[PDB]
Amino acid sequence: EVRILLLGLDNAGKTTLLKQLASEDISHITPTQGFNIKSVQSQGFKLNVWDIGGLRKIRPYWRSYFENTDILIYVIDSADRKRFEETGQELTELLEEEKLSCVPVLIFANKQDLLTAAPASEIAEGLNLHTIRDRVWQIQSCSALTGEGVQDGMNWVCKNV
């Protein structure tokens, strides 16, 4: 039984992603105060995803969830270049976290359905991800809106449980 942590900046699309995995309505998703839990079957695994509020003010609560995390899924708004640096910094601090040591991380380059959307190529080395050697990692272009590319990320997650 697999423990998934869903993090990333406010507005990146964490909850929209969570509800797509559970295959549910996505048009009434409100910003998250607190957090959301959902079980999802994929590939033969029972996945418990923790969808945590991601705005600046509540990020200090992230820590209280690191415990027993099997997989970190980290979501980025690909179509918000202005915050690339801010998410750049949150990700780098997560991977420094002792309680998350060795934990496989999947990065979702989300919102590729969009125009300004920077490709997985540019974001990856924009955050110099290739200098992660603490753990296994992957970048998946996706759109939590249409659900496209999501399954491909989840397949990698299962591969690495």
Partner 1 sequence: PKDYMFSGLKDETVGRLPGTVAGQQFLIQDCENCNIYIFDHSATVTIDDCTNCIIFLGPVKGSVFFRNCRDCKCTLACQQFRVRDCRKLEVFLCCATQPIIESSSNIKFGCFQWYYPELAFQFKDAGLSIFNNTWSNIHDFTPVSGELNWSLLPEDAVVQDYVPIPTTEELKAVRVSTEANRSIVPISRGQRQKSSDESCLVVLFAGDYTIANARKLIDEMVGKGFFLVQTKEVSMKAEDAQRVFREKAPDFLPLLNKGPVIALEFNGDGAVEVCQLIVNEIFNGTKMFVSESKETASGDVDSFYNFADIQMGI
Ligand X SMILES: Nc1nc2c(ncn2[C@@H]2O[C@H](COP(=O)(O)OP(=O)(O)NP(=O)(O)O)[C@@H](O)[C@H]2O)c(=O)[nH]1
Residues near ligand X (CB under 6 A) are 8, 10-16, 29, 31-32, 53-55, 110-111, 113-114, 143-145
Q: Is 129 in the site for partner 1 (CB under 8 A)?
A: no
Complex with Mg ion: residue 28 or 124, whichever CB lies closer: 28
**DSSP symbols for 38-53:** EEEEETTEEEEEEEE-
Q: Which helix (H) or strand (E) holds 95?
A: helix 84-96
Contact status: 29 vs partner 1 (CB under 8 A): yes
The secondary element (H helix, E strand) that includes residue 159 is: helix 150-159
Burial group, residue 82, by CB count within 10 angstroms (0-12, 13-18, 19+):
exposed
By CB under 8 A, tell whether 79 contacts partner 1: yes
Does 89 sit near partner 1 (CB under 8 A)? no
Which of 4, 8, 15, 87: binder of Mg ion (CB under 5 A)? 15
118 Rama sector, left if φ>0, alpha if ψ -120 to 50, beta otherwise: beta
Q: Whole-angstrom Cα distance, residue 36 to residue 22?
A: 12
Out of 41, 89, 101, 116, the only residue in the binding site for partner 1 (CB under 8 A) is: 116
Based on the shown chain and the rule CB under 5 A, indicate whether residue 16 belongs to the binding site for Mg ion: no
Task: Supply 99's token pair.
Answer: 């309680």
Please, what is the minimum distance in Å from the beta carbon of residue 136 to partner 1? 30
Q: Which residues bind partner 1 (CB under 8 A)?
A: 10-11, 15, 19, 25, 27-31, 33, 36, 55-58, 79-80, 82, 113-116, 145
